[PDB]
């Protein structure tokens, strides 16, 4: 049984790879998501002043 | 761009130690919290259109300005410096697991021994008491101590 | 429409209950005592009743409002201790353990598959010895877990219309590893 769980140690890291490289994708995505909304507000707002 | 290996997260309970049970705990909760904000988000909105709002924007300039200075506007994905780390500390780890996998095997190759060893014994009608303090010594009377007959203490 | 201090024999609540057929009640003291939204419920009625819900939710949840009517009424005469065997601590543990299947927050509405999953998750056993507290984290990782990697099983679910005897039994194995996970 010991053999059997000395088989399994590639999961606990592969756990911690995909959590970081999800975490970075997410990041990279809030940045996209963000830079649009900003520029979003920017004409938005020059759509309001003009009405 | 992901790159994303699935267990079945019984493993996961299987392999931790009872040291980093809490922690385990944390990273685990915090992947499937983190999961679960990656499934929340889609991919991309669309492009801003320039057409719409620069007809609607009169303001000269600063239509095609926005449009110049936004459609040529690229950020870089935020960094890690953690992954190198984190395969190597799993090389380490799989090599000290190698050495327990090598030593387990030579553990359970002198359980084997003794196993084979003792289904071959004498059938205990052709046993002496030599040979069965020979087979095992838990019973052997130590006569270091007790030198007399009989060499236990008599009120055992 | 709502009443004045709950009276429903007023002329207008009186004449638009004779209208309508189907009526949503709510009395407010479950609204102070936990359950949202606060349906106070035997005195609301769907006369349209089964004929009005999918295929999978009339093979599961009409068990359910039997055994909430069964709940009520003996917990309504055995508020002190009445006799308890087995079975009417049967009926309390099954009618509490849904009483907080049906709390939700407000605005959160969810489709018709992930319905059928969690009240199949609460009727049909693996929730009934449970500690009720536990019912809502139970309820967030259940729906975190089914929306995480069963999506084309919800599919086959809503566009099948029934519940399948393969997805019934798929959905008794993953309520079974979840209560695992959830025992873990």
Same mark, same amino acid.
């Given at each position: 049984?010991?053999?059997?769980?000395?088989?399994?140690?590639?999961?606990?890291?592969?756990?911690?790879?995909?959590?970081?490289?999800?975490?970075?994708?997410?990041?990279?995505?809030?940045?996209?998501?963000?830079?649009?909304?900003?520029?979003?507000?920017?004409?938005?707002?020059?759509?309001?002043?003009?009405? | 761009?992901?790159?994303?290996?699935?267990?079945?997260?019984?493993?996961?309970?299987?392999?931790?130690?009872?040291?980093?049970?809490?922690?385990?705990?944390?990273?685990?909760?915090?992947?499937?919290?983190?999961?679960?904000?990656?499934?929340?988000?889609? $991919?991309?909105?669309?492009?801003?259109?320039?057409?719409?709002?620069?007809?609607?924007?009169?303001?000269?300039?600063?239509?095609?300005?926005?449009?110049?200075?936004?459609?040529?506007?690229?950020? =870089?994905? =935020?960094?890690? %410096?953690?992954?190198?780390?984190?395969?190597?500390?799993?090389? $380490?780890?799989?090599?000290?697991?190698?050495?327990?996998?090598?030593?387990?095997?030579?553990?359970?190759?002198?359980?084997? %021994?003794?196993?084979?060893?003792?289904?071959?014994?004498?059938?205990?009608?052709?046993?002496?008491?030599?040979?069965?303090?020979?087979?095992? =010594?838990?019973?052997?009377?130590?006569?270091?101590?007790?030198?007399?007959?009989?060499?236990?203490?008599?009120?055992? | 429409?709502?009443? *004045?201090?709950?009276?429903?024999?007023?002329?207008?609540?009186?004449?638009?209950?004779?209208?309508?057929?189907?009526?949503?009640?709510?009395?407010?003291?479950?609204?102070?005592?936990?359950?949202?939204?606060?349906?106070?419920?035997?005195?609301?009625?769907?006369?349209?009743?089964?004929?009005?819900?999918?295929?999978?939710?009339? *093979?599961?949840?009409?068990?359910?409002?039997?055994?909430?009517?069964?709940?009520?009424?003996?917990?309504?005469?055995?508020?002190?201790?009445?006799?308890?065997?087995?079975?009417?601590?049967?009926?309390?543990?099954?009618?509490?353990?849904?009483?907080?299947?049906?709390?939700?927050? *407000?605005?959160?509405?969810?489709?018709?598959?992930?319905?059928?999953?969690?009240?199949?998750?609460?009727?049909?056993?693996?929730?009934?010895?449970?500690?009720?507290?536990?019912?809502?984290?139970?309820?967030?990782?259940?729906?975190?877990?089914?929306?995480?990697?069963? *999506?084309?099983?919800?599919?086959?679910?809503?566009?099948?219309?029934?519940?399948?005897?393969?997805?019934?039994?798929?959905?008794?194995?993953?309520?079974?590893?979840?209560?695992?996970?959830?025992?873990?």
């Amino acid at each position: 049984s010991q053999q059997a769980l000395v088989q399994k140690r590639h999961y606990l890291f592969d756990v911690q790879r995909n959590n970081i490289a999800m975490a970075l994708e997410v990041t990279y995505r809030e940045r996209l998501h963000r830079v649009y909304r900003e520029v979003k507000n920017r004409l938005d707002y020059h759509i309001s002043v003009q009405n | 761009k992901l790159a994303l290996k699935t267990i079945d997260w019984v493993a996961f309970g299987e392999i931790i130690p009872r040291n980093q049970k809490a922690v385990a705990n944390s990273l685990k909760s915090w992947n499937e919290t983190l999961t679960s904000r990656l499934a929340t988000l889609p $991919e991309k909105p669309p492009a801003i259109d320039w057409a719409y709002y620069k007809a609607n924007v009169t303001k000269a300039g600063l239509v095609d300005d926005f449009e110049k200075k936004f459609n040529a506007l690229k950020v =870089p994905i =935020p960094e890690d %410096k953690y992954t190198a780390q984190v395969d190597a500390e799993e090389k $380490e780890d799989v090599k000290s697991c190698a050495e327990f996998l090598i030593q387990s095997k030579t553990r359970i190759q002198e359980y084997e %021994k003794e196993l084979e060893k003792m289904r071959n014994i004498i059938p205990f009608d052709q046993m002496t008491i030599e040979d069965l303090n020979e087979v095992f =010594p838990e019973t052997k009377l130590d006569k270091k101590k007790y030198p007399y007959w009989p060499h236990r203490p008599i009120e055992s | 429409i709502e009443t *004045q201090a709950g009276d429903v024999s007023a002329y207008i609540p009186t004449n638009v209950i004779s209208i309508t057929d189907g009526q949503i009640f709510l009395e407010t003291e479950l609204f102070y005592k936990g359950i949202r939204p606060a349906i106070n419920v035997g005195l609301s009625v769907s006369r349209v009743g089964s004929a009005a819900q999918t295929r999978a939710m009339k *093979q599961v949840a009409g068990t359910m409002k039997l055994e909430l009517a069964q709940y009520r009424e003996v917990a309504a005469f055995a508020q002190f201790g009445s006799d308890l065997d087995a079975a009417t601590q049967q009926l309390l543990s099954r009618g509490v353990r849904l009483t907080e299947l049906l709390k939700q927050g *407000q605005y959160s509405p969810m489709a018709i598959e992930e319905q059928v999953a969690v009240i199949y998750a609460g009727v049909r056993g693996y929730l009934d010895k449970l500690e009720p507290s536990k019912i809502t984290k139970f309820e967030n990782a259940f729906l975190s877990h089914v929306i995480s990697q069963h *999506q084309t099983l919800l599919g086959k679910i809503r566009t099948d219309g029934k519940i399948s005897e393969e997805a019934d039994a798929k959905l008794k194995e993953i309520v079974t590893n979840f209560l695992a996970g959830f025992e873990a």
